[PDB]
Amino acid sequence: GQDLRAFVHDSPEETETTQRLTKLLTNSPIPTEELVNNLPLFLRRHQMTDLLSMDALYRQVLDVPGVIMEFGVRFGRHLGTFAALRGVYEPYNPLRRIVGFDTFTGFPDVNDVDRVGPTAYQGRFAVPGGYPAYLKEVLDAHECSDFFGHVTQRSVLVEGDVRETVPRYLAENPQTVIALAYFDLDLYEPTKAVLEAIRPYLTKGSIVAFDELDNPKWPGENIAMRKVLGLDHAPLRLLPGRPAPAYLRWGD
C-alpha cells in the first residue's frame, strides 16, 4: 500500500533479537555436536509461538484419521515441526503422512487482488536450487529414528503449482483422508483451487487452518474462503493471543 507501516512488520527490537541470535548461533562456543541439544537458546518468542501453535493444531487431530498437508512450505519450518511432533505423539502411526506442496521457486503468478503490498510478485519466497532434496534429507534424518522408520513415503514433498499438483496427488492417493490442512500460500487463486480440491477428503473434525486469513497484506485466503464456503460455513478460531493461524473444525 502507500503507508507500508500499516502492514505487520518487525520492530527494531525484534530485528535486533533476530540478528543477535543469528550471530550467537553461528559463532557459538557450544561444541558442534551439542548445538542440536540446545536449539531453544536461539528460538525467540515469535518462532516459539509458531511451534506451540503447530503443536496445538496437531493435538486437535490425534483422534482424527488421515494425513497432514501444508500448502506453501518454503524452507519447511512447519514440516520439521510436524515431523518431530509425530515422533512425540504417534510412534505407532505409519499412516500419518506429512505432505508439503510448493513450487519451491516462489509465487508462480499473482492475481490483482493479491497486489496490496510490495512483496506480491512472481518468485517471492523462492528457495535455493535443489532445496527440496535438502529438505527431504532433513525429514529423512528425523524418520530414521522413528518407530516406523522402515516405512518410506511418510514424508512427501510435491513440487510445482498446487493448482495442478494437489488434484494430481489426490487422484493418485484415493485412500487419502485429510486430518489437518495448513494453508500458507498467501495468494487467492491457489488457495481457492486447493480448498475446492480437498473438500471430499475432509471428515467432520478435520482441521483447516490459514496462516494469513485476516491480514491486510494478503486478502487472498479470505476472498477465497468467501467465494468457496463463506466465512460462517464453520467457526473460525484463534489460539488466544496469536493473530494467526485462524482455524476451523470441519462440520462444526
Interface ranges with ligand SAH (CB under 6 A): 72-74, 77-78, 101-103, 106-108, 125, 161-163, 184-187, 190
What is the C-alpha to C-alpha distance for residues 84 and 143, in angstroms, rounded to an integer? 9
| Segment interacting with a copy of itself, rule: CB under 8 A, options 100-108, 159-167, 189-197, 244-252 | 244-252
What is the C-alpha to C-alpha distance for residues 54 and 121, in angstroms, rounded to an integer? 28
Was 250 annotated as part of a binding site? Answer: no
Minimum distance between the CB of residue 100 and a copy of itself, rounded to whole angstroms?
Answer: 12
| Residue 194 burial class via C-beta count within 10 angstroms: exposed 0-12, middle 13-18, buried 19 and up | buried
Q: Are 67 and 170 in contact (CB under 8 A)?
A: no
Query: By three-state DSSP, how is residue 228 classified?
Result: helix
The answer to whether 241 contacts a copy of itself (rule: CB under 8 A) is yes
The answer to whether 204 contacts a copy of itself (rule: CB under 8 A) is yes
Q: Which residue is nearest to ligand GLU (CB)?
A: 211
Was 143 annotated as part of a binding site? Answer: no
What is the C-alpha to C-alpha distance for residues 139 and 142, in angstroms, rounded to an integer? 5
> Which of ligand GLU, ligand SAH, Na ion, none does residue 217 bind (CB under 5 to 8 Å by kind)?
ligand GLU
Q: Which is nearer to a copy of itself, 6 or 122 (CB)?
A: 6
- What lies within 8 Å, CB to CB, of 147 at 6+ separation is 91, 92
Minimum distance between the CB of residue 122 and a copy of itself, rounded to whole angstroms?
Answer: 20
C-alpha cell of residue 89: 505423539
- The contact set with ligand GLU (CB under 6 A) reads 119, 184, 211-212, 217
Rg of the chain's alpha carbons, rounded to an integer?
18
Binding string, 221-240, against a copy of itself, x = CB under 8 A? -xx--x---xxx-xxxxxxx
Q: Which of 91, 109, 122, 168 lies at the binding interface for a copy of itself (CB under 8 A)?
A: 91
Q: Which is nearer to ligand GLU, 71 or 250 (CB)?
A: 71
**Cα 66 to chain centroid, rounded:** 17
Within 13 Å, how many C-alpha atoms sit on residue 53's CB side?
Answer: 24
Minimum distance between the CB of residue 246 and ligand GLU, rounded to whole angstroms?
Answer: 12
Minimum distance between the CB of residue 119 and ligand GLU, rounded to whole angstroms?
Answer: 6
Q: Are strands 246-249 and 202-210 parallel, antiparallel or unpaired?
A: antiparallel
- What lies within 8 Å, CB to CB, of 36 at 6+ separation is none
Query: Which residue positions form the known binding site?
Result: 74, 77, 102, 161-162, 184, 211-212, 217-218
Query: Which residue positions form the known binding site for S-adenosyl-L-homocysteine?
Result: 74, 77, 102, 161-162
